[PDB]
Design an enzyme around this catalytic site. Sequence first.
Site, short mmCIF file in Angstrom:
data_model
loop_
_atom_site.label_atom_id
_atom_site.label_comp_id
_atom_site.label_asym_id
_atom_site.label_seq_id
_atom_site.Cartn_x
_atom_site.Cartn_y
_atom_site.Cartn_z
N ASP A 32 0.14 5.07 0.91
CA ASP A 32 -0.17 6.02 1.96
C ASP A 32 -0.29 5.40 3.36
O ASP A 32 -1.07 4.49 3.59
CB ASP A 32 -1.45 6.77 1.60
CG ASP A 32 -1.36 7.43 0.24
OD1 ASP A 32 -2.02 6.94 -0.70
OD2 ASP A 32 -0.60 8.42 0.12
N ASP B 86 0.95 -1.09 0.00
CA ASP B 86 0.00 0.00 0.00
C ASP B 86 1.01 1.16 0.00
O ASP B 86 2.19 0.94 0.27
CB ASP B 86 -0.84 0.04 1.27
CG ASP B 86 -1.62 1.35 1.39
OD1 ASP B 86 -2.47 1.60 0.50
OD2 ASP B 86 -1.38 2.09 2.37
N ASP C 184 -1.77 -0.62 5.81
CA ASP C 184 -2.28 -0.04 7.05
C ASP C 184 -3.80 0.06 7.08
O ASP C 184 -4.39 0.17 8.15
CB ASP C 184 -1.74 1.37 7.24
CG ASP C 184 -2.39 2.37 6.30
OD1 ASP C 184 -2.12 2.30 5.08
OD2 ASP C 184 -3.20 3.21 6.74
F1 BEF Z 1 -1.86 3.67 -0.60
BE1 BEF Z 1 -2.89 3.06 0.19
F2 BEF Z 1 -4.10 3.03 -0.58
F3 BEF Z 1 -3.11 3.80 1.40
MG LIG Z 2 -2.92 3.15 3.38
#
Ligand code: BEF
Ligand SMILES: [Mg+2]
Length: 259
Positions: free
Chosen positions: A12, A10, A223
């Site tokens: 962010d 992921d 997260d």
């Molecule tokens: F990049 Be993830 F969608 F928080």
């Molecule tokens: Mg995230």
Amino acid sequence: SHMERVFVWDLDETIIIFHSLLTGTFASRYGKDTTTSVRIGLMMEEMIFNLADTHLFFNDLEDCDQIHVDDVSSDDNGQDLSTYNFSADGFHGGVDWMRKLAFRYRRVKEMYNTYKNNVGGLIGTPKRETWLQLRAELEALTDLWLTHSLKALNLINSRPNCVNVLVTTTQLIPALAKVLLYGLGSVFPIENIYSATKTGKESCFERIMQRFGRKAVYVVIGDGVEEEQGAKKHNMPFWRISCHADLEALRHALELEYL
Ligand code: BEF
Ligand SMILES: [Mg+2]
């Protein structure tokens, strides 16, 4: 006859700290100044979208909601785009237009590849200096979060039977801008970045498994809930990240295994 792993990251609040700077949750969790948190968050936000609009045709490509840079590669004739004039080509149609769409995404791909290790060159002066200062304030206020995530990303990269993939709710172009400004260009091959803004992470995960095969072991790192729920629907082991310690734990596992 080697076991192979596909790390599905992921972005962010997993690899980088950005959005949590604007909401004050990071400053609040780790005792940092909230006013500095917001200032830094907004400055980076400005740089992300400015790079997007100025170099990655964001005003042109935004309304397309594309998932992967190569999704419209069918319509690319492969010509040299070095002197091609994107401004005077009337883009803003459905076939001669599809070709101009493709030209833009590939030029994005080219920008990303020639500048992934020279973002200062792309961004140009004086933005480069302001950018280096920002990254410096950011690393301090976040207690080297990015330093930690990079340690795992780089071990994954250097390892022969491991690969880095990225799935983010951020739209594709801004995502590439974030990745570039946070120095992730060299660790994420552009063909491994997926935007789940609209199709959703579950779809993206399914697509990533179709791409790498069923014999590979996938690990979904993140997260947020979306990512975790999607990992369940596909029986993909999930590695949650909530703090520095979690990135350190991943790094530790990464260095004990030889495939
Ligand atoms: F990049 Be993830 F969608 F928080
Ligand atoms: Mg995230």
